[PDB]
Ligand binder design. Structure first.
Ligand SMILES: OC[C@H]1O[C@@H](O)[C@H](O)[C@@H](O)[C@@H]1O
Ligand SMILES: OC[C@H]1O[C@@H](O)[C@H](O)[C@@H](O)[C@@H]1O
Ligand code: NA
Lengths: 346, 339
């Protein structure tokens, strides 16, 4: 079933319940996921109204872009030309600049396919918005089906050569409580390399490093605590994880990551080459989620996209988008129960 | 009473009914007025869903900007520098360029003051959007009261020197039906001059013209048909009226214009210096409003703002907005019924 109601400030909340009783909800403010529950338990982080997002943290569950991540000095090269984008983090352009797409009300239409329900959000980024050549006609379709798969499908076409590499900013916390650290979760991730950051500004260092057999190696499932407790330079730098991991094998058909807690698992599939993992390294900020003070490490993202830093590390990819060319990207998060045995204590 | 409902594509329809039983409705799609009715008759033109506006005509009732009207060649100069804005009508920038603020979903908040209810719409125009320096934080407040006064109050702040001169694009039609020409309405307007158009491109011609004692003199109430049947080259040029009229006396307290049909009249007040009057000169287009095919001359606007063409005729004013300055504008449409 599908339900809709005002979510505040003119945004709406679209709630779907599939045949298995699982419910998931989205808002057109930032074409974002607001909640995902199983048996009354929140699987992700979210707020209860639109205003909270605007006042507390606008990123959670949002669609971010046009370019996700940081671009050093806000400088990109588009068809031999240098362009400077809005700089909202020091000289850096983070997540598309200020008052970006995650802060706008997108229009939308719901399509009921029975076993699947699609919520297609649309927005036009005008030419020159935040320094980006356009216009860019974007759409993000969020769908949920009877198989417990939440899929995000992105599409875009620009009138001019530009750059495009958006992502989905959901945070998971299988504890269903922000005040509980995700160090108790098990993580499997099919990636043998990562992109180190230069320093506190978080721009890329310039090299790609092999992480096999270090505390960041999750090719074989291990608890997140292993990473959090690590004193490896990079972990200490950011007080957790806040990095792009390069997938070893590409393709929508492969389970790239799996996050488990007891009997619940979330599997990640995508057609993108990297996954930026940020573990809510907010220290004592304590943003309130459902009246619970969020803890350091109280959430984890799996932002699938082309890795940030390609400006400096060309091997990472090319995010350019040619005029008239159709962009597409697909990321899927699937929920499972008793996929494996995970019985630990922390 | 206030009622909020889905208006399509995620947009909302906010309807306010005052003590007199008059109903006015707005949508956050373009911070716009959708309907205004008394005793079951529509006083303005509007559609029944968001999709219609997008498919048929996105301008009716909307907040248009950042700059309302046409800018020759899309060119403006800011702090002595040339800037080219998005061109959406040939080389001109009309109503802020393509996919402008009238096509965006604005956020909003309703404030019930009892005798008056306000709906405050907000939107951020990012720096560089359609060529305009910013970011510009804008808000438009539409309010309605028990005295039948519909007021629009604009506010904006920019992080950078830029240009700003928005307007409200409601079309009135006291016949309550689009298939009926407004030629039968009487119009009074406190302006002795107007700004002629150069040609069919509708860019300003360059001069300011005195209209005293011509078919366009409405200082004394007159029926629109007069203007409409005029042989004035400017009338002939656009097939009706599509021009900026310069108000003789500035100030919000003065009734600047009045539109009448029978027992019903609309008074216009504004703190702006000009009113752009466009009489829906669409010929056979036949846009459908409420299933009624619109006729040529089936509507009239009162776009209060600084006259378009200031790029070429500086006497008209200056639409620059310096960084950090707060822009304000107010326009009121007051409804009256003779007893
Ligand atoms: O929400 C703010 C956070 O956004 C994440 O996507 C970035 O990776 C973090 O470095 C940043 O602190
Ligand atoms: O909606 C399009 C119309 O907008 C009006 O404000 C302009 O004055 C007309 O020239 C134009 O045809
Ligand atoms: Na809505």
């Amino acid at each position: 079933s599908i339900k809709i109601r005002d979510f505040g400030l003119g945004s709406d909340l679209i709630s779907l319940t599939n045949k298995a009783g699982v419910t998931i909800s989205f808002t057109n403010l930032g074409a974002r996921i607001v909640d995902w529950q199983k048996d009354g338990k929140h699987l992700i982080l979210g707020f209860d109204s639109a205003k909270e997002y605007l006042e507390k943290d606008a990123y959670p569950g949002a669609t971010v872009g046009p370019t996700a991540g940081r671009i050093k000095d806000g400088l990109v090269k588009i068809s031999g030309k240098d362009y400077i984008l809005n700089q909202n983090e020091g000289p850096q352009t983070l997540h598309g600049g200020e008052e970006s797409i995650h802060t706008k009300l997108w229009t939308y239409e719901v399509t009921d396919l029975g076993a699947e329900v699609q919520v297609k959000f649309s927005l036009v980024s005008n030419d020159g918005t935040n320094g980006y050549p356009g216009k860019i006609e974007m759409s993000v379709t969020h769908s949920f089906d009877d198989d417990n798969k939440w899929k995000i499908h992105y599409e875009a076409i620009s009138d001019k050569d530009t750059v495009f590499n958006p992502t989905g900013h959901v945070y998971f916390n299988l504890n269903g409580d922000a005040s509980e650290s995700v160090e108790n979760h098990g993580l499997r991730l099919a990636a043998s390399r990562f992109v180190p950051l230069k320093d506190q500004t978080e721009i890329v260092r310039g090299d790609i490093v092999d992480i096999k057999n270090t505390d960041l190696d999750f090719r074989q499932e291990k608890q997140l605590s292993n990473a959090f407790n690590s004193n490896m330079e990079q972990v200490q730098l950011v007080k957790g994880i806040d990095h792009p991991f390069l997938l070893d094998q590409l393709g929508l058909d492969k389970e790239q990551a799996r996050l488990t807690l007891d009997d619940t698992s979330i599997s990640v599939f995508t057609d993108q080459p990297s996954i930026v993992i940020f573990t809510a390294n907010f220290g004592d900020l304590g943003t309130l989620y459902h009246e619970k003070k969020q803890v350091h490490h109280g959430g984890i993202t799996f932002q699938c996209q082309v890795s940030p830093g390609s400006e400096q590390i060309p091997e990472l990819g090319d995010i350019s988008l040619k005029a008239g060319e159709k962009y597409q990207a697909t990321t899927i998060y699937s929920l499972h129960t008793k996929l494996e045995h995970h019985h630990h204590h922390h």
